Amino acid sequence: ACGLVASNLNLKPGECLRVRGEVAPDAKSFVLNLGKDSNNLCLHFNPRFNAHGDANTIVCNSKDGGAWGTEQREAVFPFQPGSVAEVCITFDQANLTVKLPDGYEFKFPNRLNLEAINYMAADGDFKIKCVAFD
Amino acid sequence: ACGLVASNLNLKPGECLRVRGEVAPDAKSFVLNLGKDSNNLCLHFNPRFNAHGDANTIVCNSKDGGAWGTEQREAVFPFQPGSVAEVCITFDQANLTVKLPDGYEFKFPNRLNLEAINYMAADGDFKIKCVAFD
Ligand SMILES: O=C(O)[C@H](O)[C@@H](O)[C@H](O[C@@H]1O[C@H](CO)[C@H](O)[C@H](O)[C@H]1O)[C@H](O)CO
Ligand SMILES: O=C(O)[C@H](O)[C@@H](O)[C@H](O[C@@H]1O[C@H](CO)[C@H](O)[C@H](O)[C@H]1O)[C@H](O)CO
Structure with a gap:
């Protein structure tokens, strides 16, 4: 919305999307x-340092034809x-897999049954430095 | 554009944009x-392997309010x-500096009045693998 927006990514099941960025020193939240x-x-994908009453919590959700789904807290x-x-x-047909720093990872269900990821956007207190496709 | 489209890049003067990609084996052109x-x-920036009657030529141009400017060839x-x-x-106010593989470097005049570069699009026989902001 205010950070980097990318489309026509053509990311396929099995392919790895790597994003490196800078977390603000006064970070409240990024998306x-x-x-x-x-x-x-x-x-x-919404890590909240201190936002919406959440402290140090990652919030995950989906959006289907403009309507938010149910939030999951990590x-x-x-x-x-x-x-x-x-x-x-x-990602695959059933799940997205998110790998984090320090060896952490979680799975989030592929609620939309997407077979390609074509869109990515960053927002909030995160400055993207590098995007790569493996 | 069938290729990657990025907006809100916020690339400022003196900052370096690095793009890595795979050129197709039967490539004719990329943009x-x-x-x-x-x-x-x-x-x-349009390297023509074999397109528009050109062979192994880099064609550069600008576009201003939908109108193509004066073409330059390298x-x-x-x-x-x-x-x-x-x-x-x-880039700066006067020139864009394009650094190529094998060390060659050329300048193309900045014909627009751009404070920052906010838009990038790739097209043709070029698959983007990595984008970095420096
Ligand atoms: O605080 C809550 O529990 C509440 O459900 C909020 O998380 C929620 O905020 C929105 O959540 C979205 C993801 O589900 C996005 O992160 C939006 O940016 C955020 O506003 C409420 O629906 C509104 O406060
Ligand atoms: O052959 C020429 O010298 C002539 O100027 C062509 O290069 C020109 O092609 C267009 O050049 C643009 C950049 O200046 C873009 O690359 C367009 O995609 C390309 O068609 C002629 O207009 C071709 O009819």
Whole structure:
């Protein structure tokens, strides 16, 4: 919405999307959105340092034809304000797999049954430095 | 564009944009477009392997409010079909500096009044593997 927006990614099941960015020193929250377009997101990835009453919590959700799905809250938080963070994402028909710094990872269901990821957007307190496709 | 489209790049003067991609084995042409949007390009970078009657020539141009400017052709063509190529681009108010594989570097005048570069699009026989902001 205000950070980097990319489309025509043509990311296929099995392929690895790597994103490296800078976490603001005064970070409250940042967002990575993945999906078909801005209205159809298979992953809304929202680490909240201190936002919406949440402290040190990753919130995940989907968006289907403009409507948000049910929020899932993760158990882990390997992010520090004022540091460099890398996130790696892959997916298949059933699940997205998100790999985090310090060896953490979680799965989030592929609620939209997407077979290609064509859209990515960053927002909030995260400056993208590098994007790569493996 | 069938290729990657990126917006909100916020590339400022003196900053370096690095693009790595695979050139198709039967490549005829590829395009990197940089500017404000699809109608307003401070750089249209178009290596022609075999297109528009041209052979192994880099064609550069600008686009201003939908109108193509005066074409310039460069003297070197350090691109091989079926290989990986990195291109680095910096800019200031006067010129864009394009650094090519095999060390060659050329300048293309900045014909637009751009404070920052916010838009990038790739097209043709070039598959983007990595984008980095430096
Ligand atoms: O605080 C809550 O539990 C509440 O459900 C909020 O998380 C929620 O906020 C939105 O969640 C979305 C993801 O599900 C996005 O992160 C939005 O940016 C965020 O506003 C509420 O629906 C509104 O406060
Ligand atoms: O052959 C020429 O010299 C002539 O100028 C062609 O290069 C020109 O082609 C267009 O050049 C643009 C950049 O200046 C873009 O690359 C367009 O895609 C391309 O068609 C002629 O207009 C071709 O009819």
